[PDB]
């Protein structure tokens, strides 16, 4: 089973098991988004570049929303503690 | 900024701190990941080479985001009873 | 302030208007024992009737004011587990 | 069997059973300090009438004190919700 993709103008034929053919046309139309971006600045020039800077930001983006989400719990952590001592001093 | 080297190529991209080990070990999956297709000769141009490479990782990332996202909604729902709970038990 | 009757007598007392009642309710019972101690003979001298049935509400209010406490301090503690549940899930 | 307080330099001898000894013993002992506050000022004129006064300070005490305490749990209360909303809003 072949899945034909279109990332950046250019088409690609990728065999893909029908169990994955979402995923791998969102992660495509992810990638391709963040390769539009990326191309239409001008810090990056070469295709090959643009790829592989794509890859990084898309790792960062994740890698930054786990952070911004365990700080998230962090602080509801101390909020929650916060409570606890005012229920231990009143009640 | 942090400096990586990939498939012969050098990439200077601004991460926090806390992420270079991960983009390192990022990075380290590109070049692998382009010398394995490179070498398959079944994808032809550095540019197409780049971006099946960088599909590849953005596909494996949205899944890993997927586990997480599981992981966080199951925790926000026992967090969202518990303190439910707690309001009634206040009442 | 609020004005009560109790075994032929006025008091004025300053009670904070959603006590009226409740307190409407404790000079009616003081009243009421006081008569019954007096008609009983076994105390005399109206200050020793007074204090007689003084003593009297006072140990039915502690008595309450157990019961009271029993019931705050069982949830004070249910409420103490559960933001603990709370601060678990979030680590 | 009798017990025998001591409230407000008189003395009396109350048919008490064993269960309830201490309990009226303390009630014995918080209406005489509350008696003795009240006739250590000068408002209450008249010794029935400085039990009768006592009883209804004591009554007051303990009604401000539920009051009190349901406006700690209530406030609280409004704090969990405070909580909640963090957790639906981001998590």
């Given at each position: 089973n072949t899945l034909t993709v279109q990332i950046l103008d250019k088409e690609y034929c990728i065999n893909c098991?029908?169990?994955?053919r979402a995923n791998?046309?969102?992660?495509?139309?992810?990638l391709d988004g963040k390769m539009r971006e990326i191309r239409s600045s001008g810090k990056v020039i070469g295709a090959d570049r643009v790829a592989v800077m794509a890859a990084?930001?898309?790792?960062h983006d994740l890698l930054h929303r786990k952070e911004r989400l365990?700080?998230?719990?962090?602080?509801?952590?101390?909020?929650?503690?916060?409570?606890?001592?005012?229920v231990d001093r009143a009640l």
């Open positions: 098991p029908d169990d994955e791998l046309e969102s992660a495509a139309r992810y990084l930001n898309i790792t365990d700080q998230e719990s962090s602080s509801t952590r101390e909020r929650v503690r916060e409570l606890l001592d005012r």
